[PDB]
Design a protein around this ligand. Structure first.
Ligand SMILES: CN(CCO)S(=O)(=O)c1ccc(N)cc1
Ligand SMILES: CN(CCO)S(=O)(=O)c1ccc(N)cc1
Ligand SMILES: CN(CCO)S(=O)(=O)c1ccc(N)cc1
Lengths: 348, 348, 348, 348, 348
């Protein structure tokens, strides 16, 4: 017996939709949901989605509040819809998937993921919910996550981190590292060897290796010497070049974090979504050096060093493909006289 | 157990709110309420009120679908709020009253009209509903309607006509003529002797007396002769003068109806609401004669003739007060040499 | 090379989208599309849909401007989406279908109806367009219309009338009568033997048989005598009973049309969409007789007479199923002592 | 001392802005202006313009309520802005001009038309207002209207009709025929010899000559015989051809009016504005004959007959330029063997 | 002579409404008020309220700019409306009270608090304004604040802190500690013994006692030992337990502040309003420990220690009622073997 007033009752009393009975008075004005509290309207939700205000409110109330894969991973794995949950995309303030299965009457395409309407879609299944591993076994297309082993199915160990209510974290009190499984047209796929992005923030960046601790503490020249990175263009690629009007390199989040402690800068996130590679229009406040499209990836510095050291440096320009977050990322490698000139996630 | 989905269910299945159980999918987008029918959104309601879309939808669904007094009568009697019903104002596409009593959680000031919050307000009671005559007896301020006598209470016979779902009519299959009662500060008040407006439309005007039949059929000079109206300025007041740039007279709806059959004209209803006297910005299409504020009243021609013939015609200008629809309507009477020059509902 | 400015250019210069090249200045403000003409904004489109303003504008510009089946027929046949066209629903001022195939980048689920995404959906195909009959042969689910025979496919002759730019008409200069075909799960289905609604308006109703001419011209008692309709409750069912507060019968559009010439009435279309059976909240202006849900069907009077005369009148109450516009319409037949009491399209 | 509350006070008490002092409570919600009357909000204005709601309300309140030139004439004369008035465009429910001179603080580019900002703009002056003829003499660019002669200035007699509060009419109680004057770059320009459109409606069309009376009353073949119109394609051009899927001709409003009495049709006004030539997407309800862009002009039939009879009929195709409403209207004349095939206002 | 333009003039020139004369050009677009400055629109106000944009703008301009009681106190005391002022609720960006008395024509229910309409409402009076103490003496229901003594009335010393333009502070240059008085149905009430919340922020929390200084500086075990808090579950209740998926305890703002210096966390304020007890959906970033509804109260640690040490610890579960900010707060006390297990502000 779903209703706007009941969804509102649950939000007010439980912090989210929890299947409780009850109603609270609600008013909708433009794209905002209010509730009456002692005779005054209190805002419960502001719709930032392209869905109707009351439909978006319900999907937000019915969001998954357990640690879930980051939307970038789900997208990279080709997920179209989730089974009996809503993956809320906090970077977009909107549902990660357009349609639902057994969640909301307005967005439901089916009540159960076994309906023939779901057959052409990659359905996301959560092995932590009863019967979901079996639903994955019967579905033609799907992605499954589990905390433990699945008999007969060989796993792909996912990232250490997961999103819990919009907070990306490596769980200590909860499990955030999942086993990933995928099926295309009934066949259990073999997921590829992959690197993972670290999902760190510029403001609260923390090193996750001795190489990363040395990058943030040592001076540019001490570091490049210590890790035998001469001829690998880390001065340009990682540290960044701010001497010309166009900002040079600066494609790794750790290099942006090192710069951030000294001089601030503006990052215009012109396509605000979760993605393996992010594009920013950067303006350096100290120098005035800027770049319209600066691609940034948060790889562990050790992983980036491994990737750049595993390339043939004898060709002027070439595309280097790297599996990161299960997807194929194309990089542009530019070399001269056997040394790197630049290496960046290809803008295509 | 009120809900948006339940109100929508009742509208779809019952044509209005009928206390039935059930829910239908609803989407709200801007000021419109839609419901999903075979996968497509079908509009159920467009909010034209100053209330939130879902609140206005509920009050419209909970509107009184029995013949009820016209909003002009309720306003003239000082009604602030209705008891356990919504009087819908079809001329404004909005509730006739701001707040409610036992109707909607968002607009309710009380569940029962006996709450101390209601004491200062003139509450409208409907004697056709059980216990409402008693609630009027216990209310400090109120207006009561009934189909018959209430022991000890001196009645006031109201208009022949009532509004049934926005259609003003004199009932043949339903009763539309009510007894009216009013109380101010605990004391039953004697309602004045009053005339009533006829509530006719310009497009579908019908005569309701032999004098009105003679006005519409006979020529101007022979009607004035037949009814001894020489010196009463009916040529100006009722027929209208279109020879000058400013349109002369034309203050009785019957005169506008007679003109309408011959030449069309524009009536700009610049304050669109139900009222005993209406003001229009009129432009005559045939002549180009116009008036920014032309006050119009729909009195039965016999009643207007009686009012104008009961005036002392020896003073240049004076205010003539007439009780119409229970309210005092101030007219401006202008005379010269014992004859009427003009008589119009005085523009306040 | 689709654009808002290009769609606007075509609307301004061609009256609709016609694949022409060019751009005109456009401004979007709230739900309205304007274009600059001699320095002033001229409204081109007001969005009444639940789609974004620019998306709805494009689908409306790309509407089918040839005679097409009425949305009620397409709905009754289970149509989900159209192939490479937009069926515009003029009764809802919105696209008849949510998604598109090869029409608009925002609403397209596929470019060609052969994509696996379309397989579960009943796709509408138009045999008047090259290659569409073959696409129907290869589609898993679909409805096809043609002007003539398709080799091997057993036809169903559809209604005489079709919708041309929102005008329902029986074509004289264009063909409006189509052959209909349907497929479910790869199998051509035999469409049932069916009656068709006449799609007439109350305001401009025209008789289409001598029985209908006799109904509108003759008095009630002599029409019933002439057509041997004694004991068939036409006085209640077709003519309508306005003597009580609840309006009796009045379920055939011809009966509403006969009443309309004499006395006006309000029809509140509370679910405004195209459907075989329509529900109205009716209020009779002359009597004040009303009904919250009055189901109305526009059958040719001869067809209704045939249906009611083909029923067993020996049971108190029973459901009578009739195929109209390819759908099963459930009627409620009430009898007493071998005579009809009432017969109405059963309110579901 | 301009204010929203003061503009609202004037609208409520005077029917428009009349420079009166006073304030009324106002509420603005979305694009609508309301005022409180006996505790309920009454709508005063709904913004249909691309200007802010309160700005549009003020310009509408300050509209010219005297007979003024039709917007099509002002546009054809190149008018950009009006001096100390607002010409309200009733066909667009918006101001005819973007900016103002001495009217509203939000839209004013100047307080007086003599400011240097106005010099490049063609300013409209009204000789009926004191000092406006002199302001035209001192303005670099402008259009002037007067009721009589202006010493030394060679006049142009304009149309018989003018717009009074949105009603186009030939004045009997007011003057609607003006003398027209124009200046470009300080130089008074000679306005061309011109025909005028009649500005009639399809629904209330009235003949304005014996030829027009004969067109509406006589049958096609006898009207063509009586007025020696053999070989002039009036059967196609004026009467219209509804035998094929594409509607033939039908370019004169009188021909559309003759057709309208017999069979109804839909005219989709896809560019809703005032113009000498109008374009409609027409669908004939009786036949199903239609045309995406059907250009229509309301010329007096005598004037159209004069234009078509003054053409050389010896060339296959050619552009015929005719001055109508002061603008050059390009027609397309198609001939074969010395007889007209078609003649239509050329679609630009 | 109130107006939108005048309110805007005052905001621009005085920072708020100050009764000055003058007007500035204003434009309203959707929910925003702009003013023209050198030909460009500058935003003055964005409506976040459920009132019309211009009405909300006026009440915000007319807000009380002196230190005033926090809305939580006024709510706890049952205040319905303020006398001749607007208490602006900065936590909701809306007026604290729906209606006004002598402030704005759109929201005024009366001009003076002595009107009979105000009789059933608890009116807030400010003894710092002339005549307000006397108005409290004559009002049936009310709450009065003063800086000094009121003859005959015994006072209730309120919190040290007050809100000055949305900044909660203990005044050094202004007086923020008021004497509170209340009247119900004409009778001067005796306000109860109460604790007060401290109204501190998590980001800028400052200790206000030696116990609070010791809590923030010492380690958990040193503190619990020093203040003899063994068996009082401060490890769970105040410090917080982050070892399990559900976050344990953490109900006092000081404990959240201590945690905040070490590890960040997300507090989803799902009912954003001023209240004695606040509810947050908390997610701990370091551990991933979370709780949908975590009730938080900012009591001085000494006050919380006093409350928990004054309870009978012999019952498994019981409701403990504590007067905080004049209202009764129910806590849930859970004990086992004479020791506290948990104590939290009861979620009811
Ligand atoms: C409860 N209030 C005061 C009534 O004593 S009110 O909410 O402000 C209000 C309610 C109804 C009307 N008609 C007007 C104001
Ligand atoms: C692609 N999708 C599922 C279809 O297999 S959909 O986008 O959610 C959708 C498309 C069209 C209709 N009619 C309904 C749903
Ligand atoms: C002042 N400006 C330029 C005029 O010289 S303007 O504001 O941009 C403008 C004013 C009026 C019209 N019709 C067009 C543009």
């Amino acid at each position: 017996a779903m209703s706007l007033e009941n969804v509102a009752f649950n939000v007010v009393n439980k912090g989210h939709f929890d299947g409780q009975q009850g109603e609270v008075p609600v008013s909708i004005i433009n794209n905002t949901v209010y509730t009456k509290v002692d005779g005054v309207d209190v805002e419960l939700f502001e719709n930032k989605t392209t869905l109707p205000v009351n439909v978006a409110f319900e999907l937000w109330a019915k969001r998954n509040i357990k640690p879930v894969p980051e939307v970038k991973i789900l997208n990279n794995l080709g997920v179209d819809i989730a089974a009996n949950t809503v993956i809320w995309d906090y970077k977009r303030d909107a549902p990660a998937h357009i349609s639902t299965i057994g969640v909301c009457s307005m967005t439901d395409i089916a009540k159960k993921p076994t309906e023939t309407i779901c057959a052409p879609l990659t359905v996301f299944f959560d092995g932590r919910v009863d019967g979901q591993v079996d639903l994955f076994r019967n579905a033609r297309n799907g992605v499954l996550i589990t905390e433990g082993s699945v008999k007969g199915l060989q796993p792909s160990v996912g990232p250490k981190q997961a999103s819990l209510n919009g907070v990306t974290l490596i769980g200590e009190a909860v499990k955030t590292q999942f086993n990933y499984y995928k099926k295309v047209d009934g066949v259990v796929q073999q997921l590829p060897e992959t690197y993972f992005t670290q999902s760190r923030n510029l403001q609260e960046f923390k090193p996750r290796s001795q190489m990363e601790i040395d990058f943030l503490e040592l001076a540019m020249d001490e570091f490049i010497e210590r890790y035998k990175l001469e001829g690998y263009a880390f001065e340009h690629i990682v540290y960044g070049d701010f001497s010309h009007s166009q900002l040079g390199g600066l494609h790794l989040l750790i290099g942006l974090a090192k710069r951030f402690k000294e001089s601030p800068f503006e990052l215009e996130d012109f396509i605000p979504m979760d993605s393996t590679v992010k594009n920013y229009f950067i303006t350096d406040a100290q120098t005035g050096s800027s770049k319209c499209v600066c691609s940034v990836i948060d790889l562990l510095l050790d992983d980036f060093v491994e990737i750049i050291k595993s390339q043939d440096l004898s060709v002027v320009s070439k595309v280097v493909k790297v599996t990161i977050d299960y997807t194929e990322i194309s990089f542009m490698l530019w070399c001269k006289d056997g040394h790197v000139e630049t290496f960046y996630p290809k803008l295509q």
